[PDB]
Amino acid sequence: KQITLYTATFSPYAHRVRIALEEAGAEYTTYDVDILRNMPDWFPLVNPLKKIPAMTFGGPEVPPDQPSPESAKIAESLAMLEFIADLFPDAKLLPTDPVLRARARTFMALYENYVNGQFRDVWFLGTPADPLLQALEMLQGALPPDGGFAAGEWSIADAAVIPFLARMFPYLEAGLGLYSKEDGVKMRKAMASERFARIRQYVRDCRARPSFANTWAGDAEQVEAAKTVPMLRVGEHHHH
């Protein structure tokens, strides 16, 4: 059955799903959608929430911009990750052991509930960096301290998290986001300090997999795509 993923280079959510699909060895189509600046009129037929990513599954082979009513319409990046794991069980995108599977789901929830919001607020609103650094420390503390991925072996939990952590470093080095220069230097100093060695190793470990290389536009390209986001008003910074 066919898979079509509606994507955008500047969407870390869509990135999650690309990574999973790579790890699964899936056959799939990707189709870019200019969701923030010029959504196509047909897009609400694949996702009525008007968000990227969106996925169609099965139905007749059709051009992405002519979706078919017969395909299943699948929304929400984390639901997609679990769906891909269900579709491709021999790819072992989750552990088999219940407790280790629980570590992956807990890690995804920790990221979604306590970290992701802080990234948004700091980068889009320029709120203080310290609560984000705290949340990143908490997340780092859920990793196996001696090495490995969230649940040991690689799982969809690492697909869920690497798109945001991998963007953090080059966006900081490029100055992109609404936070102050002061909070910028503070975040760059923290993320380079020994406080955060474990998370740097994790980013290295996730980035080294072909699933990241093959779904990453390059750091400089990703910075460029991110400047096309209006909520990231380039040249704007909030202070205290």
Ligand X SMILES: [NH3+][C@@H](CCC(=O)N[C@@H](CSCC(=O)c1ccc(-c2ccccc2)cc1)C(=O)NCC(=O)O)C(=O)O
The footprint of its own copies (CB under 8 A) covers 48-49, 57-58, 72, 74-76, 78-80, 82-83, 86-87, 98-99, 101-102, 105-106, 108-110, 112-114, 138, 141
Find the shortest distance in angstroms from Cβ 54 to Ca ion. 15
Residue 25 vs 145, nearer CB to Ca ion: 145
Write down the residue that tokens 């002519």 correspond to.
66
User: How many Cβ atoms from other residues are within 10 Å of residue 136's Cβ?
Assistant: 24
Interface positions, 172-231, toward ligand X (CB under 6 A)? 229
In DSSP terms, which residues pair with 99 in a beta bridge?
A: none
Number of residues that bind ligand X (CB under 6 A): 22
CB neighbour class for 210 (10 Å; exposed up to 12, middle 13-18, buried from 19):
exposed
Residue 44 binds Ca ion, judged by CB under 5 A: no
State the Cα–Cα distance between residues 129 and 127, nearest whole angstrom. 6
Contact 126, 179 (CB under 8 A): yes
Contacts of residue 99, Cβ cutoff 8 Å, sequence gap at least 6: none
Interface positions, 143-182, toward Ca ion (CB under 5 A)? none
Residue 168 binds ligand X, judged by CB under 6 A: yes
Residue 213 vs 225, nearer CB to ligand X: 225
Sign of the dihedral defined by the CA atoms of residues 9, 106, 48, 1, in that order: positive
Question: Of the candidates 74, 81, 30, which has an alpha carbon nearest to the alpha carbon of residue 217?
Answer: 30
Find the shortest distance in angstroms from Cβ 44 to ligand X. 11
Select the residue interacting with ligand X from 6, 10, 202, 216 (CB under 6 A): 10
Interface positions, 138-167, toward ligand X (CB under 6 A)? 164, 167
Residue 233 binds ligand X, judged by CB under 6 A: no
- Look at residue 102 and give the partner it binds from Ca ion, ligand X, its own copies, none, a contact being a CB closer than 5 to 8 Å depending on partner kind: its own copies
- Look at residue 110 and give the partner it binds from its own copies, Ca ion, ligand X, none, a contact being a CB closer than 5 to 8 Å depending on partner kind: its own copies
Residue 12 binds ligand X, judged by CB under 6 A: yes
Residue 141 binds Ca ion, judged by CB under 5 A: yes
User: What's the 3-state SS for 40-100?
Assistant: CCCHHHCCCCCCCCEEEECCCCCCCCCCCCCCEEEECHHHHHHHHHHHCHHHCCCCCCHHH
Q: What is the largest CA-CA distance in the chain?
A: 54
The site string for ligand X over 16-55 (x = CB under 6 A, - otherwise) reads -------------------xx-------------xxxx--
Query: Which residues lie near ligand X (CB under 6 A)?
Result: 10-13, 35-36, 50-53, 76-78, 113, 119-120, 123, 164, 167-168, 171, 229
